[PDB]
Structure formats: structure tokens, C-alpha cells
Design a protein around this ligand. Structure first.
Ligand SMILES: *[C@@H]1O[C@H](CO)[C@@H](O[C@@H]2O[C@H](CO)[C@@H](O[C@@H]3O[C@H](CO[C@H]4O[C@H](CO)[C@@H](O)[C@H](O[C@H]5O[C@H](CO)[C@@H](O)[C@H](O)[C@@H]5O)[C@@H]4O)[C@@H](O)[C@H](O[C@H]4O[C@H](CO)[C@@H](O)[C@H](O)[C@@H]4O[C@H]4O[C@H](CO)[C@@H](O)[C@H](O)[C@@H]4O[C@H]4O[C@H](CO)[C@@H](O)[C@H](O)[C@@H]4O)[C@@H]3O)[C@H](O)[C@H]2NC(C)=O)[C@H](O)[C@H]1NC(C)=O
Ligand SMILES: *[C@@H]1O[C@H](CO)[C@@H](O[C@@H]2O[C@H](CO)[C@@H](O[C@@H]3O[C@H](CO)[C@@H](O)[C@H](O[C@H]4O[C@H](CO)[C@@H](O)[C@H](O)[C@@H]4O[C@H]4O[C@H](CO)[C@@H](O)[C@H](O)[C@@H]4O)[C@@H]3O)[C@H](O)[C@H]2NC(C)=O)[C@H](O)[C@H]1NC(C)=O
Ligand SMILES: *[C@H]1O[C@H](CO)[C@@H](O)[C@H](O)[C@@H]1O
Ligand SMILES: *[C@H]1O[C@H](CO)[C@@H](O)[C@H](O)[C@@H]1O
Ligand SMILES: *[C@H]1O[C@H](CO)[C@@H](O)[C@H](O)[C@@H]1O
Ligand SMILES: *[C@H]1O[C@H](CO)[C@@H](O)[C@H](O)[C@@H]1O
Ligand SMILES: *[C@H]1O[C@H](CO)[C@@H](O)[C@H](O)[C@@H]1O
Ligand SMILES: *[C@H]1O[C@H](CO)[C@@H](O)[C@H](O)[C@@H]1O
Ligand SMILES: *[C@H]1O[C@H](CO)[C@@H](O)[C@H](O)[C@@H]1O
Ligand SMILES: *[C@H]1O[C@H](CO)[C@@H](O)[C@H](O)[C@@H]1O
Ligand SMILES: *[C@H]1O[C@H](CO)[C@@H](O)[C@H](O)[C@@H]1O
Ligand SMILES: *[C@H]1O[C@H](CO)[C@@H](O)[C@H](O)[C@@H]1O
Ligand SMILES: OC[C@H]1NC[C@H](O)[C@@H](O)[C@@H]1O
Ligand SMILES: OC[C@H]1NC[C@H](O)[C@@H](O)[C@@H]1O
Length: 470
């Protein structure tokens, strides 16, 4: 009504805003090299005028999906990003060089020089998020007959990042929020994913990734430890409750449209992810005044973790959108399957939205199913309205929105906010991402081993891009 139309306008504003934040033509980020994704044009309070491997990887993956669906104009953007990464990989920084840990460096200056001050480094998700983004583009190239571009440019780039993942997964580092030195759900989840699709990608170009194959099952094994019995623990080595939107992100960024409600990979419709969803969201109901008076069956403003004190601890646009996106994803999964199941694990999730919820299997033609799917859609859309209510009048999406009055705060025009909007909207519309092979990578080994595999490192030089026509 308002929502459908706002979303439609907002998607268009988000696509533009992201482009304004990518060099060397990006209107808001003059100074940024070619294919460099800037986190935000805010150069002071806070200073976000840097390129993070995570934000960039997440943003480009989004644009690659848009591109595969017909937004052909994004081609040059993706090519420039690929070329920029050929360079960054080789940049010597506080985390090391290409073959000695450099790949793990969190952020860089927009000019492609290293950031040398103190930072929570390394962040092991980066390499995995970059590989995922590149593999998508690489797949398109193979499908459209640009085999050479896939085999000689993309593959070797990906091969570097996959090698980092297989080698250091089993080592502590910082979480996506760059504050906890330990082992993080999000990181492990995206790492498992990357190796699985990394392996399929290697086979497609006529090469192999033995280190992908030997480590993915072990990463999966370890992931299981994050299930506490009632929710997903955001991090090992933390003194907090462990309720964190990090776990929602892990699920949506590892969603496979071909997967069932698999618990071992924490899919969106899995009992564990649904139980988790309620625990996380509920953790923000009583700490934000903006949430005052809402009931348990209503959407609330979501932040990162309940203990957060960054800018005083406020809801984040991307965290609120992730809460919605997981539901969109589960809805799609249930529809595709033709049923939904309520277990003891997911009962509270369902019961809060539909008081008549009881364990059992509900076929898609059943009354219970209709009742539940409507409640779920309504709830999901409700998080989106919170976003809509606090977005700026011209559509500007900030990092945070005040916990008391909803005014935008922290970094303005955060690229990540814009990407999160794009994906929540796609999912809402049933536009899902290419599958990553989850259906052959959900079997958990009987015994988990604390291990690694060492792959191979080689500097890539992008001398020329074929003249691709989309
Ligand atoms: C919807 O409408 C919105 C409202 O109009 C619109 O947002 C506005 O967009 C303009 C850009 O078109 C923004 O202008 C910038 O303002 C900067 C100063 O901001 C402070 O002061 C403002 C006024 O008092 C505040 O409004 C502003 O608050 C906002 O930002 C806060 C911080 O993130 C946030 O918390 C608030 O909630 C609020 O959102 C903030 O307090 C100003 O610095 C900046 O100037 C730079 O860029 C100009 C060109 O784009 C240059 O001409 C200028 O010389 C400056 O360039 C420097 O910085 C650039 C990066 O931004 C670099 O590209 C340049 O190379 C250069 O950098 C050098 O200097 C740096 C030193 O710190 C250094 O680090 C660099 O390495 C380099 O050496 C610009 O004028 C305006 O802030 C926005 N207003 C608001 C309220 O957000 C929005 O974009 C519209 N959205 C859509 C979707 O259309
Ligand atoms: C490298 O790989 C190996 C192999 O996979 C990893 O080893 C596994 O590590 C996990 C995590 O430590 C470990 O699981 C723990 O088992 C203990 C007993 O067997 C449990 O007591 C412990 O409980 C915590 O987590 C539960 C969820 O699993 C929570 O329900 C519970 O509340 C506990 O959580 C609190 O306490 C922890 C302290 O550990 C704290 O950090 C939390 O934040 C929270 O406050 C775990 O379940 C496996 O048994 C190990 N497996 C093997 C085969 O040895 C290793 O961790 C990897 N290393 C890195 C750095 O990646
Ligand atoms: C995930 O993958 C495993 C095999 O790796 C399947 O057994 C499971 O059903 C799901 O498809
Ligand atoms: C399912 O498959 C995995 C490998 O993907 C095995 O490790 C597991 O033991 C089960 O056979
Ligand atoms: C970690 O352990 C595995 C299996 O136990 C080895 O194959 C690997 O090489 C590393 O030593
Ligand atoms: C990853 O780390 C393991 C340690 O378990 C080594 O055996 C391997 O060679 C690589 O360094
Ligand atoms: C892991 O170890 C192998 C073998 O020593 C190297 O070739 C690789 O670069 C990484 O250091
Ligand atoms: C690891 O393997 C790659 C691919 O064969 C080599 O090019 C690299 O130099 C290292 O030996
Ligand atoms: C390792 O592999 C890269 C990518 O093919 C080469 O550019 C490099 O010379 C080395 O052989
Ligand atoms: C690979 O790494 C070398 C440095 O070893 C760079 O010079 C090259 O541009 C690429 O990044
Ligand atoms: C790409 O190739 C050039 C040589 O053509 C190297 O110097 C660079 O380090 C990377 O291997
Ligand atoms: C230019 O040079 C690079 C590396 O030196 C090649 O891999 C590329 O395909 C082109 O020939
Ligand atoms: O957007 C830049 C940077 N800001 C702070 C966030 O915690 C982190 O995830 C992000 O990469
Ligand atoms: O104030 C700590 C702050 N530092 C830097 C990180 O970007 C952010 O996630 C964290 O909350």
C-alpha cells in the first residue's frame, strides 16, 4: 500500500546511492580508486572513508545478483571491483602480505594503500565474502562463453582467498563488528559456504581445490558447536549473552534456495534459525524506548546485540532488515517445499505469531499453513515499515537510528544499509540468489578435528578484460 510503493522507490534510490560510493566516478567518494567500494562518504565523526573487504564483498555480491537478473549496466562496476582486488590482495599491510596473512586485513585507504594504525585485525570473513562475490560473476562468465575471463582472472583471484580460508579458519580473529577477538558464527558460516562453492567453481574452470574439499566438512562440524540448545551463540570467548544479529546475517548470507529447513547449515526456515530469530529480536524489545508498547507478535527495531554501547547502542537499519529477510527466505522455502513443520524447538517462534500453533507438519493447502504464512509475512513486513518510518525523506539510509526518537545517527549513507535494503526487497519479491550447493554440503562428520589445509598463493595481474557484452 505504502510499503509496496516505498520499497519500489527505495530500491531505485539504493542502487544509485551504492554507485555514488564506488570509485573512481562515484559522486560521493572522490579520492576512491576504480572499483573501490567506500563504506560511507563520512570522513569525520565517524570516519568511514575506507574500503572494508566485508562491506565491499557483501555489496558486490548484491550487485552481481542484480546483474545476473538483467541489470546489465552494472557490468563495468563489477569488472572494476575485480581489477581493484587483484591489486589489494598484493598490498602489504599490518596483517602480512598476500601469502603471509595479508588477505585477512579488514580495511584499506580508498586509494589502495594499507591502513597502518591499530585496528581489530585480522577479520577472517573478508576473504570468504570476497570469494563468494567473485564466484558469482565467474559463473556468469562461464555461462556466457567468456571462459578465459573466468579461468585466467576470476579463478586465480578466488584461489587466493579460498587458500586463506582453508588455512586459518581454525584460528581466532575479530568478529564482523570488529570488537570480539575469538571465534564467530557469521565468520564460520560464510567460510563454510565459500569453500563449498569455491570447490564447484574450481571444477568448472578445469582446476581443483583439494583444500576446499578437505576443510568444508570440518568447518561444518565446528559450526554445530554454536547451537546452545535455545539460540545461536554469536561468539566463543565473549562475556555477553551471545544474542547477536551476527547470527541472522550468517543465515541470510548462506541461504540456498534449493535447501530444505536444514539445521546443520542454519537455513532460514530451520527450527534452530527460527528459534534463534525470536531470541535475538526479543532481546531488543525492552532496551529501546522506540519499542515501548509493542507486543510480542509485532516487529521491533533491531540493533546488533543487547549489550552494544556504540553510539549508546541503537537499532541499525541493516539489522532490522536482516530480521525481515530471514522470514522472506523461510516463506520462500516453505512454499517451494509445499509444507512447514513446527517442532518443539520452533514452537515459541510460531506460537508468538499464531497462538494456535502446535507441533506437526502443515501442508501448503492446510488452514494452519495459510494462517502461519500470513502472520509471518505481516511480521516480516513490519520490520520493513520500521525502516521506512526512519529512513530520511529522500531515502537516505544511515548506519543507525536513535533508540529513543529514531533519528539517523552514526555514518550517513552507509553502503551496507543500501545493499541490505536491496536484498530484503528481492527476497520479499521471491528473487533468490543462485544456489551454492548446500544440498551436498549439509552432512556433518562424526568427529570434528581442529585442523587446516594449506592451498596456494599467487599474485594475479589483470592486463586486459575481454570486450564483454551483456
Ligand atoms: C538526501 O539528502 C541528504 C540531506 O541533504 C543528503 O546528505 C547530504 O549530502 C551531502 C553530499 O552531497 C553531504 O555533504 C557533505 O558534508 C560533509 C560534512 O558533514 C558534517 O556536517 C554537516 C553540516 O553541519 C552535517 O549535515 C553532516 O551530518 C551528516 O553526516 C554525519 C556524519 O556521517 C551523520 O552522523 C549525520 O546524521 C548527517 O547524516 C556532518 O556532521 C562535508 O565534509 C562533505 O564535504 C566533502 O565532500 C564534498 C563533495 O561531496 C567536497 O566538496 C568537500 O570538499 C569535502 O570533500 C572531502 O570529503 C569527501 C568525502 O565525503 C572526499 O571525497 C573529498 O576528497 C574530501 O576529502 C578530504 O578530506 C577528508 C577530511 O576529513 C579526508 O578524510 C579525505 O581523505 C580527503 O583528504 C560534504 O559536503 C551532507 O553531509 C549530507 N547531509 C546529511 C544531513 O547527511 C543525502 O546524500 C541525500 N541522499 C540521497 C539518497 O540522495
Ligand atoms: C578449532 O576446531 C576445534 C574442533 O572443531 C574447535 O574445538 C571445539 O570447540 C568448541 C568450543 O569451545 C567445543 O565446544 C565446547 O564444548 C564444551 C564441552 O564439550 C562445552 O562446555 C562448551 O560450551 C559452551 O558453548 C555451548 C554451545 O556449544 C554453550 O551452550 C555453553 O553456554 C558454553 O558457552 C559459554 O562458554 C564458552 C566457553 O567455552 C564461552 O566462550 C561462550 O561464549 C559461552 O559463554 C562448548 O560447547 C568443542 O568441544 C571443541 N571440539 C573438539 C572436537 O575439540 C576449536 O574451538 C576451534 N578453534 C578455533 C579458535 O576456531
Ligand atoms: C545437505 O547435504 C547433505 C549431504 O551433504 C544431505 O544429506 C542433506 O539432506 C542436505 O541436502
Ligand atoms: C555426510 O557427508 C560428509 C561429507 O560432506 C561426511 O563427512 C559425513 O560423515 C557424512 O557421510
Ligand atoms: C589437521 O588434521 C587433519 C585431520 O586430522 C589433517 O588431515 C590436516 O592435515 C591437519 O593436520
Ligand atoms: C594449517 O594449520 C595446521 C595446524 O592444524 C597445519 O598442519 C597446516 O599445515 C596448516 O598450517
Ligand atoms: C601453506 O603451506 C604450503 C606448504 O608449505 C604453502 O605452499 C602455502 O603457501 C601456505 O603457506
Ligand atoms: C601453489 O599452487 C599454485 C597452482 O598450482 C602455484 O602457481 C603456486 O605458485 C604454488 O606453488
Ligand atoms: C601464480 O599464478 C598466477 C595466476 O595464474 C600467476 O599470475 C603467477 O605468475 C603465478 O604463476
Ligand atoms: C599480486 O601481488 C604482487 C605483489 O606480490 C602485486 O605487485 C600484484 O599487483 C598483485 O597484487
Ligand atoms: C601479475 O603478473 C605480473 C607480470 O606480468 C607480476 O609482476 C605481478 O606480480 C602478478 O604476478
Ligand atoms: C596480460 O598479462 C596477464 C599476466 O601477466 C595475463 O594473465 C593476461 O591474461 C594478459 O595476457
Ligand atoms: O561499514 C564499516 C564498518 N563499520 C562498523 C561495523 O561494525 C563493521 O561491520 C563495518 O565493516
Ligand atoms: O566503538 C567500537 C566500534 N569500533 C569500530 C567498529 O567499526 C565498530 O563495530 C565498534 O562498535
Amino acid at each position: 500500500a505504502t510499503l509496496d510503493s516505498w520499497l519500489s522507490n527505495e530500491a531505485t534510490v539504493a542502487r544509485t546511492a551504492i554507485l555514488n560510493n564506488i570509485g573512481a566516478d562515484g559522486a560521493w567518494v572522490s579520492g576512491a580508486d576504480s572499483g573501490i567500494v567506500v563504506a560511507s562518504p563520512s570522513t569525520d565523526n565517524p570516519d568511514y572513508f575506507y574500503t572494508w573487504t566485508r562491506d565491499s564483498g557483501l555489496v558486490i555480491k548484491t550487485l552481481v545478483d542484480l546483474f545476473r537478473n538483467g541489470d546489465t549496466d552494472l557490468l563495468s562496476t563489477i569488472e572494476h571491483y575485480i581489477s581493484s582486488q587483484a591489486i589489494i590482495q598484493g598490498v602489504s599491510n599490518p596483517s602480512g602480505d598476500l601469502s603471509s596473512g595479508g588477505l585477512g586485513e579488514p580495511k584499506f585507504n580508498v586509494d589502495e594503500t594499507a591502513y597502518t594504525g591499530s585496528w581489530g585485525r585480522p577479520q577472517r570473513d573478508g576473504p570468504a565474502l570476497r570469494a563468494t562475490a567473485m564466484i558469482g560473476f565467474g559463473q556468469w562468465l562461464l555461462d556466457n562463453g567468456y571462459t578465459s575471463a573466468a579461468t585466467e582472472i576470476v579463478w586465480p583471484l578466488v584461489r587466493n582467498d579460498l587458500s586463506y580460508v582453508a588455512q586459518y579458519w581454525n584460528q581466532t580473529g575479530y568478529d564482523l563488528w570488529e570488537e570480539v577477538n575469538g571465534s564467530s558464527f557469521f565468520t564460520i558460516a560464510v567460510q563454510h559456504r565459500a569453500l563449498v562453492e569455491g570447490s564447484a567453481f574450481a571444477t568448472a574452470v578445469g582446476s581443483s581445490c583439494s583444500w576446499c574439499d578437505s576443510q568444508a566438512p570440518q568447518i561444518l562440524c565446528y559450526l554445530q558447536s554454536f547451537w546452545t540448545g535455545s539460540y545461536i551463540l554469536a561468539n566463543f570467548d565473549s562475556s555477553r549473552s551471545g544474542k547477536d544479529t551476527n547470527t541472522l546475517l550468517g543465515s541470510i548470507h548462506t541461504f540456498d534456495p534449493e535447501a530444505g529447513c536444514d539445521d546443520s547449515t542454519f537455513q532460514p526456515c530451520s527450527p534452530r534459525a527460527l528459534a534463534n530469530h525470536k531470541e535475538v529480536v526479543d532481546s531488543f524489545r525492552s532496551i529501546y524506548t522506540l519499542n515501548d508498547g509493542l507486543s510480542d507478535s509485532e516487529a521491533v527495531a533491531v540493533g546488533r546485540y543487547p549489550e552494544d554501547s556504540y553510539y549508546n547502542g541503537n537499532p541499525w537499519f541493516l539489522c532490522t532488515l536482516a530480521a525481515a529477510e530471514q522470514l522472506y527466505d523461510a516463506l520462500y522455502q516453505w512454499d517451494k517445499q509445499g509444507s512447514l513443520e513446527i517442532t518443539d524447538v520452533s514452537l515459541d517462534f510460531f506460537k508468538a505469531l499464531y497462538s494456535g500453533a502446535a507441533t506437526g507438519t502443515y501442508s501448503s493447502s492446510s488452514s494452519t499453513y495459510s494462517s502461519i504464512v500470513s502472520a509471518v509475512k505481516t511480521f516480516a513486513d513490519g520490520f520493513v515499515s520500521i525502516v521506512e518510518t526512519h529512513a530520511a525523506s529522500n531515502g537516505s539510509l544511515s548506519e543507525q537510528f536513535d533508540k529513543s526518537d529514531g533519528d539517523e545517527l552514526s555514518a550517513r549513507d552507509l553502503t551496507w544499509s543500501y545493499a541490505a535494503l536491496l536484498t530484503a526487497n528481492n527476497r520479499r519479491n521471491s528473487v533468490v540468489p543462485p544456489s551454492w550447493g548446500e544440498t551436498s554440503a549439509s552432512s556433518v562428520p562424526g568427529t570434528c578435528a581442529a585442523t587446516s589445509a594449506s592451498g596456494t598463493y599467487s599474485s594475479v595481474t589483470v592486463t586486459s578484460w575481454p570486450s564483454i557484452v551483456a
